[PDB]
Design a protein around this ligand. Structure first.
Ligand SMILES: Nc1nc2cc[nH]c2c(=O)[nH]1
Ligand SMILES: [Zn+2]
Length: 376
RNA sequence: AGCACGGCUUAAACCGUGC
């Protein structure tokens, strides 16, 4: 079985569908990877996650590092064994926390010093350390250590941040390659930065391509610049990346975001939207989002979504789920999440099939229509 | 507490607005 083999089977405009073959499994693309930060996809058993259609879930480096600890998971047999998910797992470097936890952070050329957001203890997360942790966890797709540049950002900050990241990228590549045990079984992705300035984006892309990575991700987006700006940056950023390699857009969920991103060449997505919203009561459907807490659902026997093939939608009504979330019942979170994730998978199935039939561009158009119409 | 809603792009079974 191959280590990492990306193959495009169909194309349409910038969009394309295919698969990534890895030792632990195959990953159909475009793909959506559910987020399982602390060694768990919130409120779901691994089998449930797999049931929705996911081929790969994602774990977080910074968080697992703190709890239950990298070395400890390594000792317990690795992340896969630990949480009960044997298919490929992608671990994020922690470069996202560098931003979301800025307040508790202290940056330096060596790496970023984090103050445990739960222990107060100090921790040095350098490119090398980030890669060692990912090795200890035994992830299949390793992410380079980077700094998800905050937004807005002056061309100056965005440039220094990006350049330090590219240097961090090289260090990551070296850390990865130092362990043959790792380099022979995992895959390494680099992350492109540069905020919303294309000259910077190009520059970052070139550094990345020079070092050489199994896959290239685009970071720094969906961080407050809005969909218009995002799609605009993607317009020129994705083409700067190696066409024969997979393109990964980090932290991007929200039905229409994904569809547009795919129209621009993205192959992979990861986002907390479906799981967090599921927990808060927000369900995603072919007719836009719907807040199940709303009064109009107290006696609505219909399922969350009319088309949805998901297990929740085959059995329970909006009325039951309404009651649940309102009551504070955990089953409520469970049901909501399973649905949002199966829907995200069904949406990905659709996006893949349309590209195969050469009628994706259309599918996108019909999608927004119905979605933004909100007749659920 | 509760009600009517909103937000969410893992320090979030959360946070906010109005009664
Ligand atoms: N490492 C990393 N993770 C994420 C997640 C979302 N955006 C980013 C990013 O720019 N870098
Ligand atoms: Zn469903």
């Amino acid at each position: 079985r191959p280590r990492f083999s990306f193959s495009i089977a169909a194309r349409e405009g910038k969009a394309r569908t295919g698969t990534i073959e890895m030792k632990r499994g195959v990953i159909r693309t475009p793909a959506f990877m559910p987020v399982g930060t602390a060694a768990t996809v919130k409120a779901l058993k691994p089998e449930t996650v797999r049931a929705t259609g996911a081929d790969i879930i994602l774990g977080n480096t910074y968080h697992l590092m703190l709890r239950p600890g990298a070395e400890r998971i390594a000792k317990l047999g690795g992340l896969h064994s630990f949480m009960g998910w044997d298919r490929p797992i992608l671990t994020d470097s922690g470069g996202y926390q560098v931003m979301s936890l800025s307040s508790l952070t202290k940056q330096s050329e060596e790496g970023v010093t984090f103050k445990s957001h739960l222990d107060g203890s100090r921790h040095m997360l350098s490119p090398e350390r980030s890669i060692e942790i990912q090795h200890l966890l035994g992830s299949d797709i390793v992410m380079a250590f980077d700094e998800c540049t905050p937004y807005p950002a002056t061309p100056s900050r965005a440039a220094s941040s990006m350049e330090r990241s590219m240097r961090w990228a090289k260090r990551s590549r070296d850390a990865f390659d130092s362990r043959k045990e790792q380099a022979e079984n995992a895959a390494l992705f680099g992350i492109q930065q540069g905020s919303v300035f294309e000259n910077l984006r190009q520059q970052s892309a070139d550094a990345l391509a020079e070092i050489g990575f199994d896959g290239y991700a685009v970071g720094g987006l969906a961080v407050g610049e809005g969909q218009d700006e995002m799609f605009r940056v993607l317009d020129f950023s994705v083409p700067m990346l190696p066409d024969d390699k997979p393109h990964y857009l980090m932290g991007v969920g929200k039905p229409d975001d994904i569809v547009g991103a795919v129209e621009r060449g993205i192959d992979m997505f990861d986002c907390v939207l479906p799981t967090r919203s599921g927990r808060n009561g927000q369900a995603f459907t072919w007719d836009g989002p719907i807040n199940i807490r709303n009064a109009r659902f107290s006696e609505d026997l219909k399922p969350l979504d009319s088309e949805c093939h998901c297990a929740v939608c085959q059995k329970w009504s909006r009325a039951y789920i309404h009651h649940l979330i309102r009551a504070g019942e955990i089953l409520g979170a469970m049901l909501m999440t399973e649905h949002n994730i199966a829907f995200y998978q069904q949406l990905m199935q659709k996006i893949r099939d349309s590209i195969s039939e050469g009628r994706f561009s259309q599918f996108a158009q019909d999608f927004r229509a119905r979605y933004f119409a909100r007749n659920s």
